[PDB]
Design an enzyme around this catalytic site. Structure first.
Site: not given
Length: 490
Positions: A96, A181, A337, A375, A378
């Site tokens: 990250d 979330e 999502t 959304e 990936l």
């Protein structure tokens, strides 16, 4: 009118647009990117308002300057903004780039009180978010966790009063756990988890352990203890005593734990949304939360991945509709999502059903009469992915004589970057926007596409747990088209 079939498209900004030092680093570079989005017809953008950045200095010490500069730029570009009250850590795994931990003063408290963090059976602490167990414990220099989230949102409303006045911000998404979330951090990469592992239960901090201990005693079963035969992060259901056929999850004890475990999230969200309604009362914005998409193991009786996450969803128990009913009283939006995923794209060993999951969550929401947005899970730049999103945005297609029979409130694409702006990728993206807009050009007036912009009203009366749980009754999802009628190609 096709304009009544127009579904707005938002684009998630690059992570760290405002860095960890609370500085709006590259105004000029971001502006160039935003101008192109606006030229593509995008309606607005979404951004994490990191708790770790804003209240880093110390308790109730908020620095909104850099963010005000970011919001000012978004406004000058003619884009609306979706603001996420991000009370969780950004990044944190090896790889990250942008890492933004929660405030250091909170971590300091954690050093002397490890139970403020979500905890697995083995005793590992997840420092990305505060356990629901301390929502109402005044252990943060006098404040409870919920008071922290409440003061934060209020300061935001006060300091961003002009942007909220101008109508720049169209909705506030309240972060409620890991990655913002509403769920337990059941599948941590930092702890070795690998798709499609079933994950682990995260109810072992002392606070929830005391909570459960009190609950079982009241049920007249002081001998019941938290789960001990659930296996580990990467196990598969049948290799565990809890999730295998006729395993513990089907016992009186198992069902009580799972009900207790999933109820904590329902109440966590309800209490915090109460504070958000108070914070933004009267503002022309909508509230919203993010629900995680656990599609692995959705295909088997145990739904193990969903269960450890906190969604008590089974073949005969709707674990999602109750969340929608909870959102009802706050007039909030359920942001989901996996909108771009197809079951054929997942490895068979994962027993994944993203398509079926989206259908259940969206249907549940619409049955409860709430707005549902979503959304892509990936990064995807291909037409196949966009067509699936468009399908989910209007499940039964366009309606030639009025608004669509079914339709999402909006869609947020992950994520803005220079790769998206490359000629090939961007040209396909422009087509996706056009189709989401029902072949119409970008339209500034929400009324034209049925998006009533009104002052946030106070929450409706509290709904008792048993009434919320009546929504667990299984219901057939609405019928879906097999292929959208608005493909980016033909």
């Amino acid at each position: 009118n096709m304009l009544l079939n127009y579904v707005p498209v938002y684009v998630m900004l690059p992570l760290g647009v405002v860095n960890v030092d609370n500085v709006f680093e590259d105004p000029d570079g971001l502006k160039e990117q935003l101008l192109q989005l606006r030229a593509a017809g995008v309606d607005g953008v979404m951004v994490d308002v990191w708790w770790g950045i804003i209240e880093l200095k110390g308790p109730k010490q908020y620095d909104w300057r850099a963010y005000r500069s970011l919001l000012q730029l978004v406004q000058e570009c003619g884009l609306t903004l979706q603001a996420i009250m991000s009370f969780h850590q950004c990044g944190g795994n090896v790889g990250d780039i942008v890492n933004i931990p929660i405030p250091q003063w909170v971590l300091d408290i954690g050093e002397s009180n490890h139970d403020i963090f979500y905890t697995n059976r083995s005793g590992t602490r997840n420092k990305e978010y505060l356990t629901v167990g301390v929502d109402n414990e005044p252990i943060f220099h006098g404040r409870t966790a919920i008071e922290i989230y409440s003061d934060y949102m209020k300061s935001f409303r006060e300091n961003m009063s002009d942007f909220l006045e101008s109508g720049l911000i169209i909705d506030i998404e309240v972060g409620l756990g890991p990655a913002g979330e509403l769920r337990y951090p059941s599948y941590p990469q930092s702890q070795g988890w690998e798709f499609p592992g079933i994950g682990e239960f995260q109810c072992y901090d002392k606070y929830l352990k005391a909570d459960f201990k009190a609950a079982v005693a009241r049920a007249g079963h002081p001998e019941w203890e938290l789960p001990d035969d659930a296996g580990k992060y990467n196990d598969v259901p049948e290799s565990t005593g809890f999730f295998k056929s006729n395993g513990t999850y089907v016992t009186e004890k198992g069902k009580f734990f799972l009900t207790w475990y999933s109820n904590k999230l329902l109440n966590h969200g309800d209490q915090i949304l109460d504070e958000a309604n108070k914070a933004f009362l009267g503002c022309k914005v909508k509230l919203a939360i993010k629900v995680s998409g656990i599609h692995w193991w959705y295909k088997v009786e145990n739904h193990a991945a969903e269960l450890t996450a906190g969604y008590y969803n089974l073949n005969d128990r709707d674990g999602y509709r109750p969340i929608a009913r909870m959102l009802s009283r706050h007039h909030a939006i359920l942001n989901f999502t996996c909108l771009e995923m197809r079951d054929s794209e997942q490895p068979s060993d994962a027993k994944s059903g993203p398509q079926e999951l989206v259908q259940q969550v969206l249907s549940g929401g619409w049955r409860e009469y709430i707005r549902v947005a979503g959304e892509n899970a990936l990064p995807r730049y291909d037409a196949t992915a966009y067509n699936q999103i468009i399908l989910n945005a209007r499940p039964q297609g366009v309606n030639n004589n009025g608004p669509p029979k079914l339709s999402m409130f909006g869609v947020t694409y992950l994520r803005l970057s220079d790769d998206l702006l490359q000629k090939s990728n961007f040209n396909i993206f422009k087509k996706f926007v056009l189709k989401m807009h029902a072949d119409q050009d970008y339209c500034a007036n929400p009324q034209k596409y049925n998006h009533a912009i009104t002052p946030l009203s106070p929450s409706a009366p509290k709904i008792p747990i048993e009434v919320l749980l009546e929504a667990t009754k299984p219901t057939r999802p609405f019928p879906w088209l097999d292929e959208t009628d608005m493909k980016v190609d033909g």
